[PDB]
Amino acid sequence: PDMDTSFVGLTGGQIFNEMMSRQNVDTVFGYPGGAILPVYDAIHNSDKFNFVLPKHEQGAGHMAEGYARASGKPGVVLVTSGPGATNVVTPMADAFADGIPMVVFTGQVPTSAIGTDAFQEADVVGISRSCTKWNVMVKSVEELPLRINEAFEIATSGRPGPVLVDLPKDVTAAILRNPIPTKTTLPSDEFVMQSINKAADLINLAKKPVLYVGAGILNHADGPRLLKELSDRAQIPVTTTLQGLGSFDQEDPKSLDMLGMHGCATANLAVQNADLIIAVGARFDDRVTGNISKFAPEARRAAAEGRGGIIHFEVSPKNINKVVQTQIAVEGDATTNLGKMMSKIFPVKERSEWFAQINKWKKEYPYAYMEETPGSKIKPQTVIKKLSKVANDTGRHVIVTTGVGQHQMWAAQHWTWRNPHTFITSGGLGTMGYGLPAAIGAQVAKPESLVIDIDGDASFNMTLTELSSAVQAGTPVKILILNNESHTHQLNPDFIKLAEAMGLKGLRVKKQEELDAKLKEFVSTKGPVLLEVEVDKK
Amino acid sequence: DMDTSFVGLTGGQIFNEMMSRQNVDTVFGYPGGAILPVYDAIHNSDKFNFVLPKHEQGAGHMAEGYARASGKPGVVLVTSGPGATNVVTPMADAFADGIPMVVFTGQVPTSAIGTDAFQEADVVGISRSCTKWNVMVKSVEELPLRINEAFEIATSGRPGPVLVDLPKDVTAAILRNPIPTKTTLPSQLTSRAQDEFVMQSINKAADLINLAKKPVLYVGAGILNHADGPRLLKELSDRAQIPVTTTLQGLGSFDQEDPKSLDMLGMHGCATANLAVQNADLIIAVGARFDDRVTGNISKFAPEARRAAAEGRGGIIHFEVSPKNINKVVQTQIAVEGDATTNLGKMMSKIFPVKERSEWFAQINKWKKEYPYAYMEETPGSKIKPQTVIKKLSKVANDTGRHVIVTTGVGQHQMWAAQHWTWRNPHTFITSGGLGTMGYGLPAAIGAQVAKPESLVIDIDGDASFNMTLTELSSAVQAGTPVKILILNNEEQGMVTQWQSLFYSHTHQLNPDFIKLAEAMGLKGLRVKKQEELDAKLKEFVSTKGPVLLEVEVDKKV
Ligand SMILES: Cc1cc2nc3c(=O)[nH]c(=O)nc-3n(C[C@H](O)[C@H](O)[C@H](O)COP(=O)(O)OP(=O)(O)OC[C@H]3O[C@@H](n4cnc5c(N)ncnc54)[C@H](O)[C@@H]3O)c2cc1C
Ligand SMILES: Cc1cc2nc3c(=O)[nH]c(=O)nc-3n(C[C@H](O)[C@H](O)[C@H](O)COP(=O)(O)OP(=O)(O)OC[C@H]3O[C@@H](n4cnc5c(N)ncnc54)[C@H](O)[C@@H]3O)c2cc1C
Numbered sequence A: 001p002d003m004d005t006s007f008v009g010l011t012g013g014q015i016f017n018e019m020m021s022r023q024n025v026d027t028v029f030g031y032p033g034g035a036i037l038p039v040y041d042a043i044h045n046s047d048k049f050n051f052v053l054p055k056h057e058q059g060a061g062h063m064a065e066g067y068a069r070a071s072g073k074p075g076v077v078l079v080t081s082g083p084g085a086t087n088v089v090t091p092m093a094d095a096f097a098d099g100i101p102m103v104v105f106t107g108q109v110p111t112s113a114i115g116t117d118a119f120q121e122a123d124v125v126g127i128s129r130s131c132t133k134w135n136v137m138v139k140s141v142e143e144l145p146l147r148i149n150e151a152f153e154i155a156t157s158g159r160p161g162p163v164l165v166d167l168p169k170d171v172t173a174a175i176l177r178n179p180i181p182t183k184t185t186l187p188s189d190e191f192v193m194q195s196i197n198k199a200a201d202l203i204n205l206a207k208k209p210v211l212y213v214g215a216g217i218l219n220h221a222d223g224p225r226l227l228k229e230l231s232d233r234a235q236i237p238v239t240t241t242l243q244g245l246g247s248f249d250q251e252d253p254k255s256l257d258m259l260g261m262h263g264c265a266t267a268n269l270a271v272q273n274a275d276l277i278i279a280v281g282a283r284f285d286d287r288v289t290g291n292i293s294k295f296a297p298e299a300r301r302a303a304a305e306g307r308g309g310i311i312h313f314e315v316s317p318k319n320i321n322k323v324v325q326t327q328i329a330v331e332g333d334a335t336t337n338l339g340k341m342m343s344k345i346f347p348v349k350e351r352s353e354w355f356a357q358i359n360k361w362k363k364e365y366p367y368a369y370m371e372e373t374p375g376s377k378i379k380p381q382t383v384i385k386k387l388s389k390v391a392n393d394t395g396r397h398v399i400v401t402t403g404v405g406q407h408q409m410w411a412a413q414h415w416t417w418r419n420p421h422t423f424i425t426s427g428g429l430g431t432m433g434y435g436l437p438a439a440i441g442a443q444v445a446k447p448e449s450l451v452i453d454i455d456g457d458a459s460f461n462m463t464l465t466e467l468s469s470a471v472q473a474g475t476p477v478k479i480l481i482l483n484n485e486s487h488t489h490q491l492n493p494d495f496i497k498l499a500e501a502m503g504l505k506g507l508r509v510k511k512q513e514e515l516d517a518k519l520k521e522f523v524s525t526k527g528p529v530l531l532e533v534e535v536d537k538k
Numbered sequence B: 001d002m003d004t005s006f007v008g009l010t011g012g013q014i015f016n017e018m019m020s021r022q023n024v025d026t027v028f029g030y031p032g033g034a035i036l037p038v039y040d041a042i043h044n045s046d047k048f049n050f051v052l053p054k055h056e057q058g059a060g061h062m063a064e065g066y067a068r069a070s071g072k073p074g075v076v077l078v079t080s081g082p083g084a085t086n087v088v089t090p091m092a093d094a095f096a097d098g099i100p101m102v103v104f105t106g107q108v109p110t111s112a113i114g115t116d117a118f119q120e121a122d123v124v125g126i127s128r129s130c131t132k133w134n135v136m137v138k139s140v141e142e143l144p145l146r147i148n149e150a151f152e153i154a155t156s157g158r159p160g161p162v163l164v165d166l167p168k169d170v171t172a173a174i175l176r177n178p179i180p181t182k183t184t185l186p187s188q189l190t191s192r193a194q195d196e197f198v199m200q201s202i203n204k205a206a207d208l209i210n211l212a213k214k215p216v217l218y219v220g221a222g223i224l225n226h227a228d229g230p231r232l233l234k235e236l237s238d239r240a241q242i243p244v245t246t247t248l249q250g251l252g253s254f255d256q257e258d259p260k261s262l263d264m265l266g267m268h269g270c271a272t273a274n275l276a277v278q279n280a281d282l283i284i285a286v287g288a289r290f291d292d293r294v295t296g297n298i299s300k301f302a303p304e305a306r307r308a309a310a311e312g313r314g315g316i317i318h319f320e321v322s323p324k325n326i327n328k329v330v331q332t333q334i335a336v337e338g339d340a341t342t343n344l345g346k347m348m349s350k351i352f353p354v355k356e357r358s359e360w361f362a363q364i365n366k367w368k369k370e371y372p373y374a375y376m377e378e379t380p381g382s383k384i385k386p387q388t389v390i391k392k393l394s395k396v397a398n399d400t401g402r403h404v405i406v407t408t409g410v411g412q413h414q415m416w417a418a419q420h421w422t423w424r425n426p427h428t429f430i431t432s433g434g435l436g437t438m439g440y441g442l443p444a445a446i447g448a449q450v451a452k453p454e455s456l457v458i459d460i461d462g463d464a465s466f467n468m469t470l471t472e473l474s475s476a477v478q479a480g481t482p483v484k485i486l487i488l489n490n491e492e493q494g495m496v497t498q499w500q501s502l503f504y505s506h507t508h509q510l511n512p513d514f515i516k517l518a519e520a521m522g523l524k525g526l527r528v529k530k531q532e533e534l535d536a537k538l539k540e541f542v543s544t545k546g547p548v549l550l551e552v553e554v555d556k557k558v
């Protein structure tokens, strides 16, 4: 039993700080309260941590999500007992649905008061069970480093996700009197190898392969690089899921852009005509596949003839052969396994016919929307198209968050995606209000990046109180509101006056001819800014 | 025996019809795909006022305010996934404070459950610990049954939130088959065994107060869960000349103008109260749960009362509806199970009309005198005291002669409201007590205003609390609710106390311009910065037609 005395004499609060440092955390999103005070005071008073304060705990959660997606690091959330904890249920479920690394620390009533219906107090472990990968209540200060290390390890491994650590006030305020095992203080087969070889064989055999890439490739820093490398080496066209946008440069000649029900027809056609589908960190969602029996007939036929089919690089065993029957499953981290596979891949000089057919499709079936005519209302797709161009022309690194609704899909389709970790949107849970706090967190993660929230009026209304949080945090986020307003009529506030009340510059566009100028002013504006564009209804 | 009246209807139409059977005239909710078959059948109908928030949490707290102001259950209609998770906080709030609330959540089709579908959440699992009961409806036939069970459970025993999960295929489906009449009708006879068991404990306590040496009425929220609660409390207080103190949640149940009033008790109550719960021998607990900030460390309070519990002098009578809550905190000597109000009526006759105890109206009737509710009143030129704002507002509101309802946020202003407002009428103080949810004030005020359209509704809020749910400002305007939003702005002091003298804070949130915010949201904004403008602005605040926000810059000190 190798024992450690280095935390003896410290409070749980300081121990928490040290553990945060060991986990390479320098940013925490949260909101104070009595039960979490011993930890909050330690974090708040240390210049080693940027503590970001929202107006509502839900904001803290969504900020952490945006931070995680932008940085690849886990988002750390620190809230109090009862309502503090219940206010982060939505962001936890959101992170759980989208596979986002998040560690949620919740203050709790003292261990002596558990289950007496004390002031605040909630069965947070019970509430959050189905919306976390794992949760726990820390029972003693001795146990605090162990649970923190476990939480972070679980949150950042397999498919990433939210974990919750319940922290009773008496535990965090207590001083460690006893040495603890050294291990608890430190942060954290040939079938797989056979599968990698076989997948290399199939790829080398394929005449019309397609790479089908999702969010999983983003869960490792080297993911997109190895994806690009495999695509170049074997000359394989690449299509992405909505959550995979950014993982592959859409200006690359081999990009098929987005796959699925709302994707480019060329991408869909490529997939239906491929003899091999190489699925990398993707879930085979029905919005991507459509009717599963009609999906990838050329791949099915190739599998039946033993010359192709489907390869699935998937980290979770439970997702293997859950939707589609695969010929080869490569279990584990996609990036890691792509790296091991690379040297076994035959360098292909060209696939002239395959790319010729693809490029013909690109001519025949581009995206199409009822474009603007003189004197007509502005089309939301046009705003997004123009803004993408304007944003790129800045030469800056650009990150995009969205709310939930038609604008979300339009952003996915009509924006030109070039860099990884630049599309931050609520896909699995579809949480309205996501855009603004996610942008703030993303901006904190990437202070030099231009961060744009493409939002709808209804979604924006959900969390608009966080506008003041953006000013306070010094995050110069660019908020875009595409305002499209029997039916359901919601009374909107004056968004420009609202922004001004919150401390931001506010801009508005009603007519087609003032759009280009305002878009330039919007992006060029220093500090946070809201631009409302009055827009045509679908 | 079989009901056929619903044959041919969609689940949405059946839901609509079932709301009528439950006497629902108001639904608070927000649309989404999974709940669309229900939403459409309701949102258009003129049998129900459908109130829309900007955020589902808003709908939840609105339902709470509605419920506490009306005595009717608050009905919530939200969609699957994030719509459902967004009402967890209001459910936990309603669970802690015993508030009747029926939550209907849309859900993915039954065939999609467990496939990690779009906007799928294990809502039944999530809401388990913060509801009295929940269920997922699995067929249209089952729909009226679960609705009826929901409303009965929410409004029975200690009232509370229930959740009913509604798969889209169930609510979109058409009922083809008759269902048992028992399942479509909402829900009394008692046995002579039950009656005697009750009446025994009743008279066993009736003579104990007929003893009546040093008696005190400890009244809580339970007395408000029956319409005849306060009145039967009033005349009981008269009959035996019994002084009355209330919990935070019992405020309004007894007139504080009355000489027999002791006002609030606890670690924030009037001194004449907590001390008269020492000098008392018979503590008559009515609808209160002996809370950690009403009770101190259990050892002390109440010693001299316990002296009765070793002399047969008296002790603790506990009128409680949940037997599970008897002797779970404080060992009682007599327990009267059931509805407090009902048992008070049954005990009324067996009470000896006493008209004096003046040795009692002495130790206490003096007692203030020493200790009132001391706070450093402001001096010319100095900062505005929050207690003063509340005192003056109470007067201004009272001058209108209107029924006044007060909601609050959570924090110092919440206690100041409780302490310094003068409480007269039942169901007029609507505050988050058990969970202490910041952001409660505004949406609760809106819901309360929908429940009581003629009432003057005031939200006495804090700056940080108000920031939590301020988006519902636009919802107030859309709904027409002329709520009076008071913001006691002490932003200069931090939210977090780091240390303090025996007789210094950090964390300052950046507030928006609240007056410009109000205007952007479509309502009137007023600001007080100086003592000299306070009176005129408080009057304009109360007199103004429509929704209005008043910010008062107050003393960060105390
Ligand atoms: C009306 C509607 C229309 C839609 N239209 C489309 C559309 O046209 N196109 C589209 O793409 N989406 C569309 N969506 C969204 C779609 O439903 C899914 O949310 C999305 O496609 C899922 O993307 P994903 O599979 O890449 O991410 P995920 O759901 O997160 O799946 C990632 C997979 O990779 C695995 N994984 C995670 N980490 C790793 C790792 N390190 N190594 C290996 N594997 C890993 C995960 O276990 C998971 O199985 C639509 C949604 C709606 C509601
Ligand atoms: C910042 C803050 C400070 C606070 N400090 C104080 C303080 O100083 N003083 C104070 O009093 N409170 C204080 N509290 C409030 C405290 O947390 C509790 O909410 C409150 O004390 C409980 O009051 P209650 O027992 O009357 O209501 P409840 O907690 O709702 O208890 C009601 C009891 O009556 C029972 N009951 C319900 N209905 C019936 C019925 N029909 N018939 C019979 N029985 C019934 C219930 O089962 C329950 O046992 C504070 C709250 C906050 C947020």
Ligand SMILES: CC(=O)c1sc(CCOP(=O)(O)OP(=O)(O)O)c(C)[n+]1Cc1cnc(C)nc1N
Pocket: A031, A032, A033, A034, A057, A080, A083, A084, A087, B409, B410, B411, B412, B413, B414, B435, B436, B437, B438, B461, B462, B463, B464, B465, B466, B488, B490, B495
């Ligand atoms: C008691 C408690 O748990 C308080 S009081 C309080 C600050 C109140 O600020 P406000 O300005 O609104 O009130 P003021 O005191 O009068 O200034 C906080 C952060 N909390 C914790 C907290 C945190 N988050 C939420 C959702 N609810 C609560 N109760």
Ligand SMILES: Cc1ncc(C[n+]2csc(CCOP(=O)(O)OP(=O)(O)O)c2C)c(N)n1
Pocket: A403, A404, A405, A406, A407, A408, A429, A430, A431, A432, A455, A456, A457, A458, A459, A460, A484, B030, B031, B032, B033, B056, B079, B082, B083, B086
């Ligand atoms: C919290 C929450 N409530 C409800 C929904 C259901 N919902 C999905 S999109 C939408 C309307 C959003 O419209 P908007 O935000 O303005 O974007 P738009 O479709 O107009 O582009 C709703 C209510 C949701 N996804 N999340």
Ligand SMILES: [K+]
Pocket: A250, A257, A412, A413, A414, A415, A416, A417
């Ligand atoms: K594109």
Ligand SMILES: [K+]
Pocket: B256, B263, B418, B419, B420, B421, B422, B423
């Ligand atoms: K009072």
Ligand SMILES: [Mg+2]
Pocket: A405, A456, A457, A458, A482, A483, A484
């Ligand atoms: Mg919209």
Ligand SMILES: [Mg+2]
Pocket: B411, B462, B463, B464, B488, B489, B490, B491
């Ligand atoms: Mg304040």
